């Protein structure tokens, strides 16, 4: 059977119940609350379609997930928020691992230039933090 | 010329 998911915009998506149950939140709203359709006021239509695609594909980090997260950092942040809101452990873990890979193996200046970060350290503060490494 | 733990042939 299929269930209708309602995004924050109002757009409705018909998704198989097995795929929708991959989200612990939607599964709780279906089983314990008995809600049809399932409103998702914290996920817009675009992020919802992206997450539905990811869940359909997943009925380590594979190459498909690497090509799937080839988006801007804002979209990755929205995907993290949506995976946390819908309690999708796999999507949350792969997105957090992607962020970590973006962090790993880089100098402080390189990480700043990567994520657009300003160095708010006092010279004394930065020297003290460096001395403890 | 071998211990009782191993053997040959």
């Amino acid at each position: 059977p299929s269930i209708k998911l309602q995004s924050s915009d109002g757009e409705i998506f018909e998704v198989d119940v097995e795929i929708a149950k991959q989200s612990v939140t939607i599964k709780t709203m279906l089983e314990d609350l008995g809600m049809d359709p399932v409103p998702l006021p914290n996920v817009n239509a675009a992020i919802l379609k992206k997450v539905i695609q990811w869940c359909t594909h997943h009925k380590d980090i594979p190459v498909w997930d690497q090509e799937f997260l080839k988006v801007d950092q804002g979209t990755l942040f929205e995907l993290i928020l949506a995976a946390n809101y819908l309690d999708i452990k796999g999507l949350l873990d792969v997105t957090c691992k992607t962020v970590a890979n973006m962090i790993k193996g880089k100098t402080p200046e390189e990480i700043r230039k990567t994520f657009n970060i300003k160095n708010d350290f006092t010279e004394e503060e930065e020297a003290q933090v460096r001395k403890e490494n | 010329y071998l211990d009782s733990g191993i053997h040959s042939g």
């Binding site: 950092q73 657009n116 300003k118 | 053997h7």
Partner: protein, 402 residues
Amino acid sequence: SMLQRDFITALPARGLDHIAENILSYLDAKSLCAAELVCKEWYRVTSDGMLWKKLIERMVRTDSLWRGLAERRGWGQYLFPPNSFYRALYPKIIQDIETIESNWRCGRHSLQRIHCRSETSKGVYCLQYDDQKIVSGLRDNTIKIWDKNTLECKRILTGHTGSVLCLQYDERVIITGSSDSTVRVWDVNTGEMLNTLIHHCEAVLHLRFNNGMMVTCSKDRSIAVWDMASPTDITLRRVLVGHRAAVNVVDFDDKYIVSASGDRTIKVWNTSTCEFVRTLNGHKRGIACLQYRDRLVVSGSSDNTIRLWDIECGACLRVLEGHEELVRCIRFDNKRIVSGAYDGKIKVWDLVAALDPRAPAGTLCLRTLVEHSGRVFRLQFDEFQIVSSSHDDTILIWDFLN
């Protein structure tokens, strides 16, 4: 869709500190230090998130070396104290591991010698130890259980009418093979002889058991696979023939059963169906010892050589020359190979270098330890220490931790 975003700052600002912490927990030590120096908020996330304590906890959960260091040094009691404590503790652990590796490489170690004081026929054929005890099979037909700490003889088991050649114990029972052609199962706690298996026509030379089944091999050129529903209910499942001389050692896992015999061949059988799979040839003389795990098979032979093979394709990955005598016992872990020869010497080789086909042969043997006056029959080691027993009726504990 914004082009850039500060996850480690945005997530805590939105009440989602746990997600930023789970992100940072994937970092290594250098990357975590770099994240500490990105900005004040990243440093705050690492500090209030106990990222160093979590990193040490993950290292313990995933590495046996870090487990042993936590259990021995004592700082493992704080796991599961501020974040600065763990931040300063990590480099001390790294330096300790470096010193332990240098001790293994340079032969720097301390020694404990246990004179078994065997009354008549001296010799210790087999052993197995843990953090609490050392169980050994002697040539006087007895099984001596010594204390790991006080070195005193805690128990003596009698029952075999021949030399106890091989043994293995778990958290439940001990199982021993002897020259009397029998396989005896004893209680690991009280020492009572629970069961006896009469099957092999000659000396049981080696045995192995795990997850409910056992394999034995005998001088009668045969292997026997037994199903163990209980320490007293042991049923013979299959009998494997094919070797043309005495089977000196046998080892197995979920995939294959590996046997080595004086016929200069290693035989790989299927574990589930007990069907012969393949024969590894190469040793110019018979094979006296073997260990098999994952895909790696390591075997010491009478040609004074050690051979490393892949279990699936049967190719010989490496030949190690160095022992001036027969390689009687051999063991390996995830880093190094420890072997013992008939001349009393023990050799420590680099396993990663040996598996690398680009390393020269001369650099493969790392150390040669000489404290035995007789044939080294059996050895077992780990990240910190080696435990060996020899024909000279002694059991040596080589501790490289200091």
